[PDB]
């Protein structure tokens, strides 16, 4: 039941988008450089 990826801390989008891509029922993830939230 991966729904936090807490162990993903200090990791990288690689393993993130990778595994995160499913775990739950295909729960994906938005890869962004922090920045603001679209104006």
């Amino acid at each position: 039941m991966k729904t936090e990826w807490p162990e993903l801390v200090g990791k990288s989008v690689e393993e993130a988008k990778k595994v995160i891509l499913q775990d739950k029922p295909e729960a994906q993830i938005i890869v962004l450089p922090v920045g603001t939230i679209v104006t």
């Binding site: 729904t3 993903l8 200090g10 990791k11 989008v13 739950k24 029922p25 729960a27």
Partner: peptide, 24 residues
């Protein structure tokens, strides 16, 4: 909400997941 398939995965300078995603 529901099982949205997206999570604000913010990255650092060298892509260092400094923020943990959850989707829950």
């Amino acid at each position: 909400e529901y099982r949205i398939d997206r999570v604000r995965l913010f990255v650092d300078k060298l892509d260092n997941i400094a923020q943990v995603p959850r989707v829950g």
